[PDB]
Paper text:
Kinesin motor proteins hydrolyze ATP to produce force and do work in cells. Despite their diverse functions, the kinesin proteins contain a common motor domain with highly conserved or invariant sequence motifs that mediate basic motor properties, such as microtubule binding and ATP hydrolysis. For example, kinesin-14 motors move on microtubules towards the minus end instead of the plus end.
Both proteins were crystallized bound to Mg-ADP and are reported here for the first time. Despite its importance as a potential drug target, this is the first [name] structure to be determined and the only one available to date. Comparison of [name] to Ncd shows that the two motors are structurally very similar to one another with differences in loops, which are longer in [name] than Ncd H1 or H2, as predicted above. In order to evaluate the ability of the [name] L5/α2/α3 pocket to bind small molecules, we superposed our [name]-ADP crystal structure with kinesin-5-ADP-ispinesib. Interaction of the side chain of R521 with other residues stabilizes L5 and maintains the closed conformation of the potential binding pocket, disfavoring binding by small molecule at the site. The [name] conformation with the highest predicted AZ82 free energy change shows movement of residues, including Y409, L599 and F656, to form the binding site. The movement of F656 allows the hydrophobic AZ82 F3 group to become buried deep in the [name] α4/α6 pocket, which is likely to stabilize AZ82 binding.
Residue numbers in the entry: 309 to 336, 343 to 351, 368 to 476, 484 to 490, 494 to 529, 534 to 571, 595 to 663
Amino acid sequence: GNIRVFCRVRPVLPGEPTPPPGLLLFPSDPPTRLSLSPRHDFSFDRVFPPGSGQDEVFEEIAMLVQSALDGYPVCIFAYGQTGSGKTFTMEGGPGGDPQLEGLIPRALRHLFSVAQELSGQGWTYSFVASYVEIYNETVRDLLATGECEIRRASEELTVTNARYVPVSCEKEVDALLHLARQNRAVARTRSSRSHSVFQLQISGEHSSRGLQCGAPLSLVDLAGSERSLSTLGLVIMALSNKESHVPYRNSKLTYLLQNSLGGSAKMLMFVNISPLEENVSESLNSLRFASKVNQC
Ligand SMILES: Nc1ncnc2c1ncn2[C@@H]1O[C@H](COP(=O)(O)OP(=O)(O)O)[C@@H](O)[C@H]1O
Ligand SMILES: [Mg+2]
């Protein structure tokens, strides 16, 4: 239903073999079709060409993101093979170039400023960030300073032995991402085979009216798919077909996110695609996966 699927093809980078210019076309409100090489033809909510900037990728979903201030759970995924651009889309560049910042700092910046607009209407908002890594039935805290288990509250789920950090500006958010990169660097003494799960608990409360609101925003940099992950697909289809049973428990990822998947949760699916000829085989896999989600 309220599932949006977006496709993103990254630019060809230095050193990489130059692909045939007809390997990927982008025919012609935003562009929506991707053509591989009768010729495989796909269609999505938006197809971002290689020249797409980070700011444009976020602007397409800014309004869906702020519904998480209105009690809607929002769950965003980056899916695709290793080297296709999942981490660039989610985190962005590691060097602090503001044009290369990804969805996590742009989402949080956008939330901070809608929240300040709404404070003149009597609202106060609180934001609590966590960041955890799921590698083969193990959970590590990417925000450790300085064993983790997915546990219950009621019925909420948290991660034990993980930091839950109140954030209120862009610098505190950036510092958490840089800490995540430090902890990954130390762990070398892996992340291509791991889900990275960024969560922000949003609490709102009105001053003179007896109103409160609350919702999780999740930004998920999935493990690479090549050649855990299959369980996510199974969980998404079970909900599409209104199955009496949904097997959240079959993976630590769906078990953690089970309350941000069904129900009224808005779900955003970015499929990252490698432009290269050598990767045409895994690109087809990722595009079929995305085509399947978009019909669910
Ligand atoms: N949209 C993009 N524009 C420019 N460079 C990109 C883009 N997406 C990915 N890259 C580059 O491609 C390489 C692989 O990206 P990465 O996000 O690490 O892949 P993944 O997380 O999917 O394994 C990185 O060097 C990154 O800088
Ligand atoms: Mg990555």
